[PDB]
Design a protein around this ligand. Structure first.
Ligand SMILES: Nc1ncnc2c1ncn2[C@@H]1O[C@H](COP(=O)(O)O)[C@@H](O)[C@H]1O
Ligand SMILES: Nc1ncnc2c1ncn2[C@@H]1O[C@H](COP(=O)(O)O)[C@@H](O)[C@H]1O
Ligand SMILES: [Cl-]
Ligand SMILES: [Cl-]
Ligand SMILES: [Cl-]
Ligand SMILES: [Cl-]
Ligand code: NA
Ligand code: NA
Lengths: 182, 183
């Protein structure tokens, strides 16, 4: 759907920083896109347009960069936003999922009352790398009886194989900006 | 220009309160129940955008992570850039930092040096104003880069902790939707 001029504007809006966080890493920085009101609005409008007819009842966004894309997408779809958070940050009853980091593991939590049977959920995050956090988030949603088949991202690091990993869990990914490298 | 009684009631009733979180003797005001209610969440964003539509804001700064959920939709509603202020070691480009006092220790916030220019007029957004310590440090980051900040907006004001007065004395006018008593 989106024009060359639009996709090139979004790809050009994202700074890449060599040797962050360590030598030999090319970091894709979405904060330059957030600072540009044309790039930020275009990115939210394109994600909303993709899902306007999917019957989404809830958007789930991952802490913390995913909040910046999932919450505007919730408002554009006319639905509730549910955060999945690092441990200890949600105040009411939660469930937890563990996922791999580059170094060791960590947890994501969700409020148990945030998703129920008959919900259809979209997961939104800034960037698809391993897809570890998304696999964890999908497991939280399904444990509460929610349906999820869709994840949406600004950036797709397509050399890291996150998309095929999610396809095997029944998730279709939509991404605006593909970048090579790992 | 302000919430009606019906709107204030609806927003206040959309917020759940949790005793003895995150420590005993605090009554935690939880915005997640407002976020999950599309009527409450859209209303909250509409009321903040309306307040600043004529204020000449050039940038919105939102503090990590609950502030992101209100500052980002306000930035989009105003048609202006969003700048996150984050916990240390998350922002990848050149930063400056501020250290501030919490009840049981110190906390640190960072901002990208290139995100704020002299002449920028900045609105700061967070979910909840308590002592004002967090927003005070955020305002220092913005002012150290030459940004001009006269305005902070919140969903919730804990009016007993006098954050509003602490901020007005720093040239920051607060706009908050839901007042609650207590700490
Ligand atoms: N913003 C980013 N830009 C570039 N590489 C990234 C970014 N975020 C994560 N990675 C890389 O993806 C892997 C981490 O995967 P994950 O644990 O899914 O974040 C490592 O190889 C990281 O260097
Ligand atoms: N009762 C409370 N309910 C929820 N959040 C709180 C409460 N008291 C303080 N906070 C949060 O704690 C941090 C410290 O607030 P401040 O004292 O304004 O720096 C901010 O993120 C506030 O939003
Ligand atoms: Cl993050
Ligand atoms: Cl659990
Ligand atoms: Cl937070
Ligand atoms: Cl009360
Ligand atoms: Na490498
Ligand atoms: Na009007």
């Amino acid at each position: 759907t989106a024009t060359a001029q639009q996709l090139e504007y979004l790809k050009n809006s994202i700074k890449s920083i060599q040797d962050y966080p360590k030598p030999g890493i090319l970091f894709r920085d979405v904060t330059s896109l957030l600072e540009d009101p044309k790039a930020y609005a275009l990115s939210i409008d394109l994600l909303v347009e993709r899902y306007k007819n999917a019957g989404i009842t809830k958007v789930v966004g991952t802490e913390a960069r995913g909040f910046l894309f999932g919450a505007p997408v919730a408002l554009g779809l006319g639905v509730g936003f549910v955060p999945v958070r690092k441990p200890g940050k949600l105040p009411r009853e939660t469930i937890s999922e563990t996922y791999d980091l580059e170094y060791g593991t960590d947890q994501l939590e969700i409020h148990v009352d945030a998703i129920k049977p008959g919900d259809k959920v979209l997961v939104v995050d800034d960037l698809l790398a391993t897809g570890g956090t998304i696999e964890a988030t999908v497991k939280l949603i399904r444990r509460l009886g929610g349906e999820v088949a869709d994840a949406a991202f600004i950036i797709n690091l397509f050399d890291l194989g996150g998309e095929q990993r999610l396809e095997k869990q029944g998730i279709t990914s939509y991404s605006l900006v593909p970048f090579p490298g790992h």
